[PDB]
Amino acid sequence: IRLGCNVSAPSGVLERVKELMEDYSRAPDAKFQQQFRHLLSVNFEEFVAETKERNADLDWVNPKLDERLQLELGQRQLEENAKKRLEARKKLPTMKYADDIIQAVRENQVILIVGSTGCGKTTQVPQILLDDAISRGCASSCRIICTQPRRISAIAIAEWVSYERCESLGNSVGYQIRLESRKARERASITYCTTGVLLQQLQSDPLMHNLSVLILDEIHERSVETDLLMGLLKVILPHRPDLKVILMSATVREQDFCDYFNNCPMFRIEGVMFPVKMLYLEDVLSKTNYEFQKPPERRMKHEAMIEPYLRRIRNSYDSRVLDKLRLPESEGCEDIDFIADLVYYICENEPEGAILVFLPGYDKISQLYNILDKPKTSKGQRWRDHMAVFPLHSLMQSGEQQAVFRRPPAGQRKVIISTIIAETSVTIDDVVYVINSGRTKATNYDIETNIQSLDEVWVTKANTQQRRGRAGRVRPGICYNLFSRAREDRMDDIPTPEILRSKLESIILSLKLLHIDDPYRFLQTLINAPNPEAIKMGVELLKRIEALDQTGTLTPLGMHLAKLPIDPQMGKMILMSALFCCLDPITSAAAALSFKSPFYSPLGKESRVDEIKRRMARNMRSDHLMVHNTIIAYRDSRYSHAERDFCYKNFLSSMTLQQLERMKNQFSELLYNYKFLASSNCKDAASNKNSEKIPLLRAIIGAGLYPNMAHLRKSRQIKNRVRAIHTMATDDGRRVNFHPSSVNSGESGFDSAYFVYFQRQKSTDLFLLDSTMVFPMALIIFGDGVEAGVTQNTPYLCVAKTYYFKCNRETADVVIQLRSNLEKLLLKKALYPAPIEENGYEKQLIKAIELLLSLDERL
Template sequence: MFLFSYFTQAVVKDETPDQWDGDDDEEEQQQQQQQEDKEELRKKDKDLEFLFQEVRRDSSLDERLQRDLQSKKSDSKYKEMLVSIMIKLINSNRVLVVSGETGCGKTTQVTQFILDDYINRGVGSMCRVVCTQPRRISAISVAERVAAERAESVGNGNSCGYQIRLQSRLPRRQGSVLYCTTGIILQWLRSDPLLSSVSHLVLDEIHERNLQSDVLLIIVKDLLSTRDDLKVVLMSATLNAEKFSRYFGNCPMIHIPGLTFPVEEFLLEDIVEMTRYRPQNKDRRPTWKRNFWHGRNARSEKEEKETEYKESWPCYARTLQGRYSDSTIEAVEMLDNDDKIDLELILALIRHIVLNDEEGAILVFLPGWDNISTLNDLLMTNLIFPSHSSQVFKRPPPGVRKIVIATNIAETSITIDDVVYVIDGGKIKETNFDTTNNISTMTAEWVSLANAKQRKGRAGRVCPGKCYHLYNGLRASLLDAYQLPEIMRTPLEELCLQIKILKLGSIARFLEKALDAPTEKGVNLAIKNLTDLNALDHSENLTALGFHLARLPVEPHIGKLILFGALLGCLDPALTIAASLSFKDPFFIPLGKEKMADMRRKVLSRNSKSDHLTIVNAFKGWEEAKQRGARYEREYCWDNFLSANTLQMLHNMKGQFTEHLMNTGFVSSKDPKDPNSNVNSDNEKLIKAVIVAGLYPKVAMIRPSHSKKRPGAKVYTQADGKVNIHPKSVNAEESEFNYTWLIYHLKMRTSSIFLYDCTEVSPFSLLFFGGDITIQKDGEQETVAVDQWIVFRSPARIAHLVKSLKKELDSLLEEKIRNPAPVDWQNRQSKDCAVITAIVDLITTQEKPAGGNRGYDRAWAPRGQHIHFNDDDDDDED
C-alpha cells in the first residue's frame, strides 16, 4: 500500500540539477529514507530491480550515446530505418496504432526508431522504452535480434535487454529498450501504479487478444489520464487496427507494408480437382446435409453462421458446376465434414506437391496431437522417414523434401525459413469455458481469417509460395475475422484477484471497460467461486487468504495448495505439484512411442494412484540424476520420457514460490528443501491431503466396473454424472482402489468429459480439508457429510472427534493465514503443533477398510441433488 506514495516521484522528466539546489534538510532526509526503502525492496524482489532504478538527466551519457549512434550508422549490421512520419506521430500524440503483417519489422524497428530519435535530439538518457510480448520466447528472441542489429550483445548494460519470469538480461537503466512479457508489467503495477520510470510503453501483438493484454489495455487507458507524459504505441495485425484506434479515442494509425513474397491460394475444390482425390466412404456427408437433400432438414439451433452455411450450401454447390468436374463437386460435398479433417486427402496433396512442384519445405497445420500422430503414421507407411524435431529449422540435403507437421504455434512463435508450401487444415483447438456447467471445453473449431492469413504468410518468406486451405469457398466467406478474445472464454478467478490486489475497484465495473467485456454470468461465477474459496468476503474485499493467493503467480486453487504445503510441513512436494499444474507436466510423448511413455509414467507412479505424486517422483529422480552429472541427467530424462528444460523450469518456479513464502513469513528459508519446512514430505497420505486442501471441491467418486471390454473403474462427479479418466492418467486403467474418492485439477469436455489428472484420496483427507462437516443419525451409526454430498458412515465417537478436530484446525489455519509464521515442529506442547500432529497421525494411520471400499463410504445427495449412475454402456459386458 505504501509503495504508491513512495515512488510516484520517479516520473521521467527533463530536469536540470539546479532545480534541486533549494531543497532543505528535511526533504533530503525524506529522499534518503525513500532510497533506503527502495534498496530494501529491490533486494527482496529482483524482478523490481529495473523498475526502481532512478532516471535523471545525464549529459555525459547523452553525448556518448550520440557518438555511439553515429558509429553504428556506418556499421552494416545496423540498418538506419528512422521513419520521419512515424516519429512525428509518436511525438505529437499520446497513443499511436501501428499495423502490419508478420515479418514487416514493426516489432524490432519501432522501438529503435523511438530510442534513436531521442539520441539524435541529445536527450537519449530520458528514453526508456518497454515493449510487451505475449510469449517468453518472443521477448528473448526479439531482444537478441535488436541487439544484433545494433552491433551489441543483449543486456549487459547495453541498449537492449529482456525480462521474463525467472530470467532477465537487463539493458542500461537509461537510453534503453526492454522487451518483457505482459505479466511483468502487471507485476510492476503492484509496486508502481503509474509506471513512473517508463517513457514509452509499446504493446505488441495486441490482436492476439490474450487475457493479460486485454487487462493491460484497460489499465493503460485509465493510466493516460494521470500520466500525461507517457507515450503508448499499440502494434497489431492489419485486420482489426481500427478497433484499437476507436478504443483509444480514434487515435492515429500508421500501416507498415509487409515484406513477403506473393502466395497463391487454393481452396478445397481446387485441391480435390488437382489431386483427383475421392473419399473412401460414399456417404460421408454430415447428417444435416444428407437430410437436406431428402427434404427433412429442420432448422438447427446452432450459431447463426452455421445456419447460414447450411442454407447457402445448395446455391454454392450450383456455382461450382461448369468450373469443376461433377466428381470433384461430389467429393467436396462428402468432404465438408464439420468434425474431422481428412488426413488421407492431406497425404494425397503432399504426394502431389512432391511429384509436381519445385523444391521447398511443406508445413502442415493440424489442430492437435491425435491428428499429427495419425498423419505421421500415414507418411511412415508411404516410405517417408521422420527426423527429430530439432531438424525442423535445418535445410534438408538435395533430393530430400522436408515436411513439418505443427499446431497453430507455427503461425507466429517459430519461423521455418525454407517453407514454400503450406497446408492449412482449417481447424484450431480452442478452449472455452461453459459458465452454465462450470466446465472448460476444448474443441476443434474453424480457423479465423487472422489464423488463415498468418498461415498463408508462412509460405512467402523466402520466395513465392502456395497455400492450400482444406475448406471450400463458402466456408471461407463465413470465417470469423478473429478468434473470440480469451477474456470471453476463460475462467476469471485469477484475473479477479489481480484486479483486487492492484486496487482497481469493483471487479464488474473494471471489466465492463474491456475492449470486449466478459459476460456478466462469467464474472459473477468467478466472484462466487472466490467467495466459496474464502478468498473474497461478501463485500468483494480480499480476505487474508485472498491477499496471499493474489500475490502468488498462480491460479487460486494452486496457490492454496502451496500455502497448505508450507503449513503442514511438506513444502517441497507441494511446490513440485503446484509448479507442474501452473506450467505443465514434464513428460513428453515421442511419435510412435506412446505405449512406452505410458509404461514409464506408470512405473514412476509407484502404485500411488496419483498423477500428482507421479510428477513428484519423476522430479526427485531427476534431481538425484542431476547431482551425479550431466550424462546421468540425460539418460534419466531419455529413459523416462522427460523434458530436462521443463524440469529446470519447474525447479526455478519452486524457488520463486519459496522466496515469496519466506518474504510473507510462512517459511524461514528460501530453500524448498529446508528440513524445517519438510518434516512430513515423505508422508504420502499427508501430501494427498494437501492436494485436497488446494483443489477441493474438485472431487469425483469411484465405482468398480465389471466391464470386460473397458478396463478401469467408473467415475462420477456431482455436477456431471459419469465422466472419464483421461488416457494419459496413471489411473486410466486402474481398477483396484483403496478408497472411493478422487481429487482432480483439470476437468475438460472434448469428445467426452475427462479428468486429465487425479489422485486417490482417503475419507479423512476430505473430512479435514474439504468443506463444511455435518453429522446426522443413520440407524445405529452416524454419518459425517462434507458439504452434504460426500458422506461417510462412522461410529458416533469418531464422528464427533473429527468435527471437533476440524473446528480446531480451521481456527488454527485461519490464524496462520492472518499472521503467517512457520510451525514450530520441535515444540510439541504448542497448540498449533499439537492440533496438526493429531490430524497428521489420523490421516497417516488410517488403513484400508476390511473388504475393500464396499460399505465404508457412500455418496449421499439430499434435497434432490443426485449423482447419476448411467451404467447402460459398459457394465457386465463380455
C-alpha cells in the same frame, strides 16, 4: 441418501488429539497487518496520490549522462559497421515512418502501429524512440518497455535488437521474463518483456511511473493480458499525462483497438514477405483430380452452403470438380488419403521447398504420418524414402530439436505435420508450401452446465491469413486451403478472444491489489466484456476459498494469494504446504498444474509412456505426486551426471523440467520473503519434515483442488488382463472416467474410492485429466459442508453435504472441534505471517492433524 465407509478413530488417537487441541488453545511484529488495513482504508483518490510519491525515480535525470550518451551515440554514426548496420535498418519499412512516429508520439498520448510480418515494427520502433531522446540529450529520461505475448519472442527480439546496436545483451537492450532476466541499463533503455511480468510489476507500480513509453504488441491476438492491460490503461492514463504508450498490431481487426482508444492515430506500414499464392478446395481438386472412395442433415446443411456457390462459378471449373465440392468429405481433413495425395502432388511438380501441413490435433497427425511412413498405395511407395517427415505437437520433442528447423538432407524434401503450434509459436524457415486443412481444436466452457469441452472446429480467417505467411519467408510459396471459398465466408474473423473463455477468479483477485474493487464495473470496460455470470462464479469461488469475505472485500489470505504468480487455489495449496512442512512435493504438484507436464508423448510409444508414468507414480495413485517423483529422479540424475540418458530413457523434456524447478524455487523465495518459511530452499529439511508422509500430501493436495471430487464404485476383471471399467461420478452426479493419459486410467484395487482432480474435460467421454486418490478424513478436515448427525439410525459425518460417511459422535465431535481451530489458526497466520515454531503452541494443532491423517497409511 446413501452412506459411505466408517471414518471413526480409535480411543487412544482421539485422546491425544484432544490433548493437542487443548494444548494449542491456551496460547496468548506484523508489518503486513499495517499493510493490509492500509490498502482497505484508502480510497482510489488517495491511492493514486500515495503511489506517485512512492514511485518517483523518473522525476530525476542526469545531464552528465545525457550529454555522455549523446556524444557517444553517433561516434558510432561515423564508424563503418554502424553506419553499415543502419542502411540495412533503413531498408525496413518502419524506418521510412521514423520521423512521423517521433511526431505522432510527441503530440498524442496513445498511437497505434499496424503492420504485417517482416516490417520490423517490433525491432525498430523502440530503437527509433530511444535514439531520438539520446540525440536530443534526453537519454536519461527515456525508459522503454515493450511487451511480447510469448517468452521466446521476448528473448530473440532482445538479442537481435541488441546486436543491431553492436552491444552484447544488457547494455541498452534487455529482456525480463518469469524466472529469467538479462536486464538492460536503468535509463536510456529498451526492455522486452512478457505481458505477465508487467502485470505483476503493476501491484508495486500501479500507474506506471517507472517507464516513459509502453509498447503493447501482438494485441491482435487478444490474449487475456493484452486486453487486461488496455482496460487498465484507460484507468491509468487519465492520471499520467506524460506517459507515452503505442499499441502494435497485425492486420486483423485493427480498427477494434483504434475504436477502443477513441480513434487514436493509426500507422499502417508496409509488409516485407514473399508472395504466397492461395488455392482453395475447388482449385486443389482442379489440379490433383483425387476423388473419395474406400449424418441426417449434414448432407443438406452443406447443400445449403455450397451449391448456392457451386452454381455461381458453374463455368469456372470442370463439373467433375464441382460435384467434388458437394461432398461433405471434401473440405477439412475427413479424407486424409486426400491430403496424402496432395503431398505426393507437391513432390512431383512445384519445385524445391518444404511442406507444412496444418491438421487439428494429435489424432489425425498420426494417421498421415503412418500413411506417409508405411503407405498402402503405389505412388506412396515411390515417395517414401525421399521425404523427411517431422510431426510437430506441443506434447512431442521434435519442437525442441535442431532437425525440424534445419534444411533437409540432399535428395529429400521436409514435410512437417503440425498443429496450430506452427502458426505463431514455432516457426520453420524453409517452408514454401502450406496445406491448411482449416480444422483445429479449441476448448469451450459451458457456463450453464460446468463442462469444459475440447471440440474440432473450423479455423478463423485470421488463422488462415496467418498460416499463408508461413510459406512466404524464403521464396514465393503457395498455401493450399482444403475448403471452399464459401466456407471461408462463414468463418469468423478472429478466434474467440480468450478473456471470454477463461476462469476469472485469478484476475478478480489481481485487481484488488490495484485498488480495483468492483470487477463487474471494471471488466465491462474491456474491448469484449466477460459474461457477468462468469464474474460472479469467480467471486463465488474466491469467497469459498475465503480469499474474500462475504461483503466482497479481500481478506488477509486473499492478499497473499494475489501476490503469488499462480492461481488462487493452488496458491493456497502452496501456502498450506509451508504450514504442514511438505514444501517440495506440493510445490512440484502446483508448478506442474500451472505450467506443462514434463512427459513427451512421441508417436507410436503410447503404450511405453503409459508404463513409465505408472513406474514413477510408485503406486501412489496420484498424477501430481508422480511428477514430483519425476523431479526427484531428475535431480538425482544430475548428481549422477546421467541427465541425458535419464531424459531419453524416460521420455522427459529437460527444458520444462528445469522450468518446473525454477518455478518451485520461485514459490520458495516468495513464501520465505512473506515470512512463511525460515529458509528459501524448497529442499530444506525443516520445510520438509512431512514430505514423505503420503496421507499428509493427499490432504494438502485435496485442500487445493477441493471441491473437485469424484467417487468410484465399480471395477472389472473379465476378461482382459489389466485394464478395468470404472463407473465413477463427480460430486455433481455426472459420470466420468480417468483420462487415458492419467496414471489411474484402467487401474483396479484402490485403497480409497474418492479422488480429487484439477481439470475435467469432455472429448470422447467426461474425463478427469489428472487425479490424486484422497481419503475421506482428509477432505472432512480441510473442506466445507461438514455436518454431524443421524440418518437411517446411523451416526454420520459429511463433506460438501454430498459425501456422508459413518462415524460415531466421539470422533465427529473432535474433528468438528479440530476444524474450528484449524480455521482460527489459518486466519491468524495470514494476518501475522511467521513460520510455525517446531516446538510451539501452533505446531501442536499441526501434529493433531498429522495424527488423524496418519490413520490412512498403507498397511
